[PDB]
Motif scaffolding. Structure first.
Motif, PDB file in Angstrom:
ATOM      1  N   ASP A 206      67.941  71.755  64.606  1.00 30.74           N
ATOM      2  CA  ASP A 206      68.956  72.728  64.226  1.00 30.74           C
ATOM      3  C   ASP A 206      68.819  73.203  62.786  1.00 30.74           C
ATOM      4  O   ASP A 206      69.471  74.183  62.411  1.00 30.74           O
ATOM      5  N   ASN A 207      67.994  72.538  61.973  1.00 34.49           N
ATOM      6  CA  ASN A 207      67.827  72.949  60.585  1.00 34.49           C
ATOM      7  C   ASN A 207      66.939  74.179  60.445  1.00 34.49           C
ATOM      8  O   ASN A 207      66.970  74.833  59.398  1.00 34.49           O
ATOM      9  N   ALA A 208      66.154  74.507  61.470  1.00 33.63           N
ATOM     10  CA  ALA A 208      65.270  75.664  61.442  1.00 33.63           C
ATOM     11  C   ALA A 208      65.711  76.762  62.401  1.00 33.63           C
ATOM     12  O   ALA A 208      64.998  77.759  62.557  1.00 33.63           O
TER      13      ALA A 208
ATOM     14  N   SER B 121      56.639  69.638  48.451  1.00 28.86           N
ATOM     15  CA  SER B 121      56.034  69.606  49.778  1.00 28.86           C
ATOM     16  C   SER B 121      54.749  70.422  49.831  1.00 28.86           C
ATOM     17  O   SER B 121      53.876  70.144  50.662  1.00 28.86           O
ATOM     18  N   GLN B 122      54.613  71.425  48.962  1.00 24.58           N
ATOM     19  CA  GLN B 122      53.408  72.246  48.954  1.00 24.58           C
ATOM     20  C   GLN B 122      52.219  71.526  48.332  1.00 24.58           C
ATOM     21  O   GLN B 122      51.075  71.921  48.577  1.00 24.58           O
ATOM     22  N   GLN B 123      52.461  70.486  47.538  1.00 21.41           N
ATOM     23  CA  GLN B 123      51.409  69.713  46.891  1.00 21.41           C
ATOM     24  C   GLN B 123      51.512  68.238  47.263  1.00 21.41           C
ATOM     25  O   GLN B 123      51.394  67.352  46.414  1.00 21.41           O
TER      26      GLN B 123
ATOM     27  N   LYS C 214      60.574  67.035  50.700  1.00 20.47           N
ATOM     28  CA  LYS C 214      60.920  67.029  49.288  1.00 20.47           C
ATOM     29  C   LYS C 214      60.609  68.390  48.671  1.00 20.47           C
ATOM     30  O   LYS C 214      60.228  69.343  49.357  1.00 20.47           O
ATOM     31  N   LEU C 215      60.778  68.473  47.350  1.00 16.11           N
ATOM     32  CA  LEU C 215      60.521  69.721  46.642  1.00 16.11           C
ATOM     33  C   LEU C 215      59.032  69.968  46.440  1.00 16.11           C
ATOM     34  O   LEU C 215      58.597  71.125  46.424  1.00 16.11           O
TER      35      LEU C 215
ATOM     36  N   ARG D 290      68.353  66.451  67.329  1.00 15.29           N
ATOM     37  CA  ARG D 290      69.201  67.639  67.343  1.00 15.29           C
ATOM     38  C   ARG D 290      69.365  68.209  65.940  1.00 15.29           C
ATOM     39  O   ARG D 290      69.248  69.422  65.731  1.00 15.29           O
TER      40      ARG D 290
ATOM     41  N   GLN E 286      65.966  70.011  35.754  1.00 15.61           N
ATOM     42  CA  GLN E 286      66.234  69.683  37.151  1.00 15.61           C
ATOM     43  C   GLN E 286      64.941  69.528  37.943  1.00 15.61           C
ATOM     44  O   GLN E 286      64.825  68.624  38.780  1.00 15.61           O
ATOM     45  N   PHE E 287      63.961  70.399  37.693  1.00 14.05           N
ATOM     46  CA  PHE E 287      62.678  70.287  38.381  1.00 14.05           C
ATOM     47  C   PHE E 287      61.981  68.978  38.034  1.00 14.05           C
ATOM     48  O   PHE E 287      61.445  68.298  38.917  1.00 14.05           O
TER      49      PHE E 287
ATOM     50  N   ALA F  37      72.847  48.781  58.416  1.00 12.87           N
ATOM     51  CA  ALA F  37      73.871  49.276  57.503  1.00 12.87           C
ATOM     52  C   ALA F  37      74.903  50.121  58.238  1.00 12.87           C
ATOM     53  O   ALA F  37      76.107  50.011  57.975  1.00 12.87           O
TER      54      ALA F  37
ATOM     55  N   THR G 225      69.063  72.099  72.445  1.00 14.65           N
ATOM     56  CA  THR G 225      69.374  71.581  73.775  1.00 14.65           C
ATOM     57  C   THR G 225      68.124  71.498  74.642  1.00 14.65           C
ATOM     58  O   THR G 225      67.872  70.475  75.290  1.00 14.65           O
TER      59      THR G 225
END
Ligand SMILES: Nc1ncnc2c1ncn2[C@@H]1O[C@H](COP(=O)(O)OP(=O)(O)O)[C@@H](O)[C@H]1O
Ligand SMILES: Nc1ncnc2c1ncn2[C@@H]1O[C@H](COP(=O)(O)OP(=O)(O)O)[C@@H](O)[C@H]1O
Ligand SMILES: Nc1ncnc2c1ncn2[C@@H]1O[C@H](COP(=O)(O)OP(=O)(O)O)[C@@H](O)[C@H]1O
Ligand SMILES: [Mg+2]
Ligand SMILES: [Mg+2]
Ligand SMILES: [Mg+2]
Lengths: 121, 40, 98, 93, 149, 373, 521, 197
Positions: free
Chosen positions: F300-302, F18-20, F15-16, F296, F229-230, F354, F307
């Motif tokens: 792949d996000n970082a 994540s640091q706290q 989440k946003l 995967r 937004q925050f 689902a 593989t």
């Protein structure tokens, strides 16, 4: 930025578009391959019936504004001029190879290794 | 204690030229190296 | 508009009013932008002026400088999450040292 | 993680450079001189002489600011930078 | 109130001072007489008031409001009770004996369950669970076809 | 409590905030633990005040709402009390007519002056009956006039009108009073009680606090940070964490997070496919191979070699080594069960059901008919 | 400009060069549009319009022209607002201050073009303004005890104020008229008591000042015209349908006899109220509302003059002229008091009949009848008279005069030059520019007059530097003469406010950058 | 407010007006308004007066409900006409009997009431329904009464100097109160020559 005066893509969008175009070109003449397939029909604007199913003539009388489609058409024309038989099987095999290589490209694999493996095979 | 500047158009022109050059270099950065692809 | 040697600005309203000030938040509130990020900066300046009141443009100047500095690291080859974590750690260190 | 701290330290010195630019002197030279005078002695009260008074010590020039305000400004700027670095999409008509 | 348009006429200050007092006294007396018969939950079919709701909550009387002109009759036929067009205390033969009336929630939706411990009863209700409206509609149509068969 | 904190930190990892994540975990734990027994999500108040950072967010043990519209006698009453008495009412306290369908046919000036005096007499009698209950704070949904505000300020009493229904219900559930419509029955068991009541300036807005209630069953969150937004993202993350904690309390069954459960399911489906012959083997094999899309996509996000990580995970699952997932900071694989990464097991089951239902509904579609307009 | 769009469609923004250039062009245009009407020999302009009702006005004041033009430049709007504030303050010097501001901005343009920091120019201008305001206080003449010299100073100030407009032909009488009208206020600063009645008939030579009071109202029917030795009593009540009761009283009877009795009772109550009004022993009733038919005949049957249609201004003027108070209720005749008048008649001025009030006691207020051939000439005369009255009230409340004509500007320029000749740095250019802008005003005056401006300015500067710190400029011939011999005298507070407003406007416009204009609606 | 470590921006009134100089900005420990007196013949400056804050207008009482007065004879009309002036004189004496020298209302006045106030020597300010009443009650310390019967001597505010000020040649008059006690609200007067200044 970068004034090109036109339109451009990114990286995967062009590959997906080429894969879709190749799949459509393959499916266009996918009902007249084996001996049990039937023929097609091509009508122009003035009314000229053209009943044929060789594949090369259908690709030549198609007029598609896509680069991959024109490449496949000229490849089929070269195959028909050099030999004369097997004008649709080569296009179908090329389309299947492109579809198989797209999945490898989407799996974070360099295209050079895929090309080398295809050449070795 | 001096050297005052009252012009800003040459600075903006130079900034725009630098930005255009950087954009061109970033656009041509793909076709570079032995592991590069071809453009259409 | 930063420092004692800075000059003032002049804004024009929708009808035809003339407003001259140097508070920073009032200049950004009547700027009429349409790029989202500019609206976000205006909202941040308004929140800063409502909370503290002093230094409305300094925070946005620091944010712009930090973004310009992080642009080089992003063009080099650093993940934005690591850059954000390092920036947060540096901000915490600066706060603890001040 | 040492590359982000150096970038934050380089971007934090944008206030003295802007002050020296608005005053009418060399920004980088004055910043380097202030940094050398601060790292040579032991007094964190050496700023930029904007009024041209001679001495660069801000303790005798009656220059008083705020602490909680600066802390809140730094925290808000860091939060906004982290939020902007996270957004990477746009869908406008 | 009255069906014909009619206003109240007051002259002296005694009436102006005692009108609201008498109204509140009559409302409290009616609320006490309604709850004296042993009713634990009152299911209305119209607009409620603030003073009536406060008097019902003071004597611990559950109020259920619903307007559909069919669900009320279905509930009356299920619990075996008759509808009263006036605010009069019902008779023993006009009471709705139930088993368990509570308020729960399933799938982030507040619902009032009127489960009865009797094996027979009157009517029942089939609860459907799913993730798509089309699948729920198909299941409802299949249930209707099975009922018709 | 440790399991709840770990689940909250795991749910608030991507989440946003994540640091706290270690600061909001205890907050949501204390918020859910003090939610009676039926777990009423509507009892938790979420307030958004402009200004402040993420560390300035506090969690009160009572109720809090924004200051409504005041009149002319609001700055003449004390805004701080030690042990006051809150009286939640619901009647209008202003000079107005009795009923809208009334008509007074006076004769002379005697009865006219009598009615004029009796109106103020009734008003003062009501104001005294409200004051005779020993209360200090008056809260009502209907707007309060200036006469009652000036009368309450002369006796050092606080009053506030135009209170919303949700805020009044939260205050009643926190203190322990009841909604009183009439003022002719103001006893001692229908009045609230608190330990402190102040009114400070937070972010340039006036807010009230009612902390110090041992019999309270609700709370109020004060989310700070950006502007819109925050704050919306923070509220969404708080709601997600609250839902995760509620599910962990209602089900008390969590498994290891990451891509270990999916890998184990894929391995089990691949091992089971080697028994049933025919065309059923290919479908089960494809279903097992499709389940490996979680690790995967996680790797792949970082920008990592997905593989090699997938091959190592498959080898570790085949050689055993049950809850072996992926790692982002270590750039390798580790045990997610020992890294304090726990997630609710019912969420995966619901997602799988689902997805299966959606796939069945999509496959069942044969001919699509469309109509104009 | 950045390729990424930031502002909305239809919003321009000027940086530093274009914004300053446009501001300087607008300031120069504003200063040159009004520069023709600055000197004593200036002309008039025509301000015609088409969106209203074809209004045509001819005036010589700069603030009125700037307000009627309707400019659109941001700096021009600030200049117009400053001129309006100055006119609302004292109303005597708008063209001078706007010309000084235009000259200061023109000098700042060339200073910025010479690579000079604006902060140094601002500091130099502030130092020059401080030196000017310090040297101006030392050159002031105090008066108040000597009434003989005070009257002559007031007459000279009024003449100098009136000689700068269209009243130069009748200054020999309008100055005395304004002096006599000012002394009638008894030191009161209420300018609303002086009523100005403009009529279309005679010329400027037929204008005079009434020693009493005039009213443009009509009297009732069957009432005496001229009443000798009367007692005016101002009232404030509602005689036209006396129904001040806000009660819900409604007649709910069942017979016409009851309605007739109610009507008779109302008539008897009205008659009793009328009798109680006349119970004070008066013979000239004045009300602020309308009078119907019953009170009119009731007042006419006893021989009491009734005046209708009177607003708050007329009531206040009558109370200041006579001495009575605005009474009502009518219950205690001892705590009401009356007025004093021994001559009441009706005169005919041109084609209308007006009530003449003579033989007053106090006389705090007065009226002035103006005659002209054209509406524009009448409006110009009224504006000049109002400006003269305002400047006279200002110089009376100030109780100190300063020799005008251009001596104060020369003294300020000399002080600024002496201050700049002692300090180094880049601040000497701003003080020199301020001195040049201050000395340009006599140059413009002499250019508008029709004589040699440079030679006269040089001679005046040489005289002020050698010792003659009291000379000015002779407008009757074009020479150099002493200001204490001719009779030219201005004010101190007016000039101080003009200088302060000019300095403030210059300092505000000097630090102007980034003109961001929003989308027009 | 050191006992709670907070301030209130609503108490500090920041008002400005065109005309004058920038150096004329001074602090006033009272409450300034943008209104004048109800009568031009009323005394402008006072040295010792008491503030009487009122909310009800100077009109006869009228209930907000639907009331109908029926007059069927001359006796009823005469009784109403007598009771009107009786209540007027009663409220006028009640305003004077409280000992105050300057009453402050909220709504408009009338003609007979204004004449009686001028005869009894008692200035008043009209149209002050905004925060001016609250500022005066906070600064002067006087209480607010809803009616006239509750106007006692203890619910009055002490005034030091109540005198209006005149500007230039315009018709704008502002009343300012000074020389107050330990007030908790001050006003800031801003003067200049420009609008943006
Ligand atoms: N006399 C001074 N001495 C040193 N620094 C100053 C002085 N005045 C202003 N500054 C600096 O200039 C910066 C800008 O301040 P200012 O323009 O007054 O408000 P803002 O911070 O809103 O721009 C401040 O961060 C302050 O540190
Ligand atoms: N700290 C962590 N360690 C390992 N895996 C994690 C961690 N945080 C999140 N994940 C994984 O990321 C996936 C995405 O979770 P999340 O973003 O919270 O919700 P969603 O599944 O809706 O995206 C989850 O399946 C979880 O297994
Ligand atoms: N009779 C006179 N003799 C000398 N100087 C005069 C005379 N009349 C006007 N002036 C000069 O003309 C200038 C402008 O005067 P005026 O027109 O009254 O003010 P403005 O130009 O602001 O309308 C004044 O500064 C004054 O010195
Ligand atoms: Mg063949
Ligand atoms: Mg600041
Ligand atoms: Mg003039």
């Amino acid at each position: 930025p970068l004034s090109v005066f036109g339109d451009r893509s990114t990286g995967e969008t062009i590959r997906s578009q080429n894969v879709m175009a190749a799949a459509s070109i393959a499916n266009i003449v996918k009902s007249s391959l084996g001996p049990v397939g039937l023929d097609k029909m091509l009508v122009d604007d003035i009314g000229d019936v053209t009943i044929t199913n060789d594949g090369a003539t259908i690709l030549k009388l198609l007029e598609v504004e896509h680069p991959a489609a024109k490449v496949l058409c000229e490849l089929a024309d070269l195959q028909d001029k050099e030999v004369g038989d097997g004008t649709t099987s080569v296009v179908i095999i090329a389309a299947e190879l492109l579809k198989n290589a797209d999945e490898l490209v989407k799996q974070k694999i360099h295209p050079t290794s895929v090309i080398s493996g295809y050449r070795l095979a | 204690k001096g050297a005052y500047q009252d012009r800003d158009k040459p600075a903006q022109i130079r900034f725009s030229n630098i930005s255009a050059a950087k954009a061109v270099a970033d656009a041509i950065r793909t076709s570079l190296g032995p592991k590069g692809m071809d453009k259409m | 508009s930063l420092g004692p040697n800075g000059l003032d600005k002049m804004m024009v309203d929708k009808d035809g009013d003339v407003t001259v000030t140097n508070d920073g938040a009032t200049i950004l509130s009547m700027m009429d932008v349409d790029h989202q990020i500019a609206k976000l900066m205006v909202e941040l300046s308004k929140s800063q002026d409502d909370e503290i009141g002093d230094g409305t443009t300094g925070v946005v100047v620091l944010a712009g400088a930090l973004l310009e500095e992080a642009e080089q690291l992003l063009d080099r080859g650093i993940h934005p999450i690591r850059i954000a974590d390092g920036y947060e750690q540096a901000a915490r260190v600066a706060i603890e040292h001040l | 993680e040492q590359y982000a701290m150096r970038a934050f330290a380089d971007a934090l010195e944008v206030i003295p450079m802007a002050l020296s630019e608005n005053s009418g002197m060399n920004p980088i030279q004055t910043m380097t001189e202030v940094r050398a005078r601060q790292v040579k002695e032991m007094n964190p009260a050496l700023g930029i002489d904007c009024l041209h008074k001679g001495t660069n010590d801000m303790k005798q020039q009656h220059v008083i600011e705020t602490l909680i305000g600066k802390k809140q400004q730094i925290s808000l700027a860091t939060q906004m930078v982290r939020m902007i670095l996270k957004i990477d999409d746009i869908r406008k008509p | 109130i009255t069906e014909t348009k009619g206003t109240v006429l007051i002259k002296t200050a005694e009436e102006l001072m005692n009108f609201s007092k008498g109204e509140e006294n009559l409302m409290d007396a009616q609320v006490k007489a309604i709850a004296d018969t042993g009713a634990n939950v009152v299911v209305t079919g119209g607009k409620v008031a603030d003073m009536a709701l406060h008097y019902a909550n003071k004597y611990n009387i559950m109020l259920v409001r619903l307007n559909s002109k069919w669900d009320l009759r279905r509930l009356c036929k299920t619990v075996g009770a008759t509808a009263l067009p006036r605010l009069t205390p019902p008779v023993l033969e006009e009471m709705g004996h139930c088993d368990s009336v509570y308020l729960s929630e399933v799938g982030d939706t507040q619902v009032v369950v009127f489960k009865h411990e009797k094996e027979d009863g009157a009517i029942s209700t089939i609860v459907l669970r799913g993730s798509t409206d089309n699948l729920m509609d198909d299941i409802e149509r299949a249930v209707d076809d099975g009922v018709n068969t | 409590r440790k399991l709840l904190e770990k689940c909250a930190m795991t749910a608030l990892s991507s989440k946003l905030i994540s640091q706290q994540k270690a600061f909001f975990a205890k907050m949501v734990v204390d918020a859910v633990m003090m939610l009676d027994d039926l777990l009423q999500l509507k009892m938790i108040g979420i307030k958004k005040v402009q200004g402040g950072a993420l560390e300035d967010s506090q969690l009160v043990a009572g109720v809090a709402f924004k200051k409504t519209f005041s009149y002319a006698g609001f700055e003449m009453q004390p805004k701080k009390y030690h042990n006051p008495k809150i009286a939640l009412l619901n009647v209008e306290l202003e000079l107005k007519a009795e009923k809208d369908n009334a008509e007074i046919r006076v004769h002379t000036v005697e009865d006219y002056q009598a009615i004029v005096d009796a109106e103020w007499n009734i008003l003062y009698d009501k104001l005294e009956k409200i004051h005779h209950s020993g209360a200090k704070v008056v809260l009502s949904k209907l707007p309060i006039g200036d006469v009652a505000t000036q009368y309450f300020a002369d006796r050092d009493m606080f009053c506030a009108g135009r209170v919303p229904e949700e805020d009044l219900k939260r205050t009643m559930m926190a203190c322990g009073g009841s909604i009183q419509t009439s003022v002719n029955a103001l006893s001692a068991d229908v009045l609230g009680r608190c330990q402190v009541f102040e009114e400070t300036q937070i972010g340039g807005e006036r807010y009230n606090f009612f902390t110090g209630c041992p019999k309270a069953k609700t709370c109020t969150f004060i989310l700070r940070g950006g502007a819109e937004q925050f704050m919306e993202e923070t509220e969404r993350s708080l709601h997600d964490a609250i839902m995760i904690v509620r599910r962990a309390i209602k089900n008390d069954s969590v498994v290891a997070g990451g891509g270990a459960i999916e890998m184990e399911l894929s391995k089990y489906l691949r091992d089971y496919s080697r028994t049933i012959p025919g065309k059923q083997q290919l479908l089960i094999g494809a279903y097992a191979k499709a389940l490996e899309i979680i690790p995967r996509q996680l790797c792949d996000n970082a920008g990592f070699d997905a593989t090699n990580i997938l091959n190592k995970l498959r080898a570790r699952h085949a050689q055993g080594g049950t809850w072996y997932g992926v790692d982002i900071n270590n750039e390798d694989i580790a045990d997610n069960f020992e890294a304090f990464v726990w997630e609710p097991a019912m969420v995966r089951i619901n997602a799988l059901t689902a997805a299966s239902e959606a796939a069945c509904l999509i496959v069942s579609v044969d001919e699509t008919i469309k109509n104009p307009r | 400009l950045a390729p990424v769009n930031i502002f909305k469609a239809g919003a321009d923004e000027e940086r530093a060069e274009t914004a300053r250039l446009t501001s300087f062009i607008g300031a120069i245009a504003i200063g040159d549009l009004v520069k023709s009407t600055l000197g004593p020999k200036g002309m008039d302009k025509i301000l015609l319009s088409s969106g209203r009702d074809a209004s045509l006005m001819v005036t010589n004041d700069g603030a009125t022209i700037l307000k009627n033009i309707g400019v659109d430049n941001p700096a021009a709007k600030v200049l117009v607002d400053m001129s309006r504030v100055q006119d609302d303050e004292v109303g005597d010097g708008t063209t001078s201050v706007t010309v000084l501001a235009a000259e200061l901005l023109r000098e700042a343009e060339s200073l910025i073009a010479k690579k000079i920091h604006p902060q140094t120019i601002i500091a130099g201008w502030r130092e020059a303004t401080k030196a000017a305001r310090e040297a101006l206080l030392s050159s002031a003449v105090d008066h108040g005890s000597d009434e003989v010299k005070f009257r002559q100073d007031l007459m000279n100030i009024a003449g100098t104020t009136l000689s700068s407009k269209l009243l130069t032909h009748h200054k020999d009488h309008f100055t005395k008229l304004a002096v006599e009208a000012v002394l009638r206020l008894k030191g009161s600063g209420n300018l609303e008591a002086i009523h100005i009645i403009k009529k279309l008939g005679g010329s400027l030579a037929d204008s005079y000042l009434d020693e009493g009071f005039l009213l443009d109202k009509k009297i009732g029917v069957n009432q005496p015209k001229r009443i000798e030795n009367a007692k005016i009593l101002i009232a404030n009540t509602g005689m036209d349908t006396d129904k001040i009761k806000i009660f819900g009283s409604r007649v709910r009877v069942d017979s016409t006899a009851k309605v007739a009795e109610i009507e008779h009772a109302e008539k008897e109550k009205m008659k009793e109220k009328v009798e109680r009004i006349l119970k004070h022993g008066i013979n000239c009733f004045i009300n602020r509302q309308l009078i119907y038919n019953y009170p009119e005949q009731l007042f006419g049957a006893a021989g009491v003059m009734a005046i209708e249609h009177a607003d708050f201004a007329g009531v206040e003027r009558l109370a200041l002229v006579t001495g009575g108070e605005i009474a009502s209720t009518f219950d205690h005749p001892e705590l009401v008091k009356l007025g004093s008048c021994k001559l009441i008649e009706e005169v005919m001025i041109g084609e209308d009949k007006l009530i003449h009030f003579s033989g007053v006691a106090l006389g705090e207020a007065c009226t002035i009848v103006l005659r002209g051939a054209t509406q524009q000439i009448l409006d110009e005369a009224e504006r000049s008279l109002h400006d003269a009255l305002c400047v006279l009230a200002q110089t009376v409340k100030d109780s100190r005069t300063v020799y005008g004509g251009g001596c104060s500007e020369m003294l300020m320029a000399h002080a600024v030059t002496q201050l700049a000749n002692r300090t180094p740095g880049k601040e000497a250019v701003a003080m020199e520019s301020y001195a040049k802008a201050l000395r340009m005003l006599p140059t413009i005056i002499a250019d508008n007059a029709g004589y040699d401006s440079a030679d006269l300015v040089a001679q005046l500067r040489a005289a002020h530097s050698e010792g003659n710190t009291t000379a000015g400029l002779d407008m009757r011939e074009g020479t150099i003469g002493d200001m204490a011999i001719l009779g030219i005298t201005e004010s101190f507070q007016v000039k101080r406010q003009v200088l302060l407003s000019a300095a403030e406007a210059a300092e505000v416009i000097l630090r102007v950058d980034n003109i961001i204009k929003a989308a027009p609606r | 407010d050191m006992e709670r470590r907070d301030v209130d921006f609503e108490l500090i009134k920041v008002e400005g007006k065109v005309g004058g100089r920038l150096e004329d900005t001074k602090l006033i420990k009272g409450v300034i308004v943008d209104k004048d007196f109800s009568h031009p013949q009323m005394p402008k400056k006072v040295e010792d007066a008491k503030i009487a804050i009122l909310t009800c207008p100077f009109e006869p009482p009228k209930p907000k409900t639907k009331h109908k007065l029926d007059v069927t004879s001359v006796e009823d009309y005469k009784a109403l006409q007598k009771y009107e002036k009786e209540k007027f004189e009663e409220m006028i004496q009640q305003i004077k009997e409280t000992g105050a020298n300057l009453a402050i209302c909220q709504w408009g006045f009338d003609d007979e009431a204004n004449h009686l106030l001028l005869q009894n020597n008692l200035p008043a300010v009209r149209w002050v329904g905004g925060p001016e009443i609250e500022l005066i009650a906070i600064a002067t310390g006087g209480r607010i009464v809803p009616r006239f019967s509750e106007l006692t001597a203890e619910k009055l505010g002490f005034a030091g100097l109540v005198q209006e000020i005149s500007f230039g040649t315009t018709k704008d008059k502002m009343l300012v109160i000074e020389q107050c006690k330990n007030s908790r609200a001050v006003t800031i007067f801003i003067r200049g020559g420009n609008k943006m200044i």
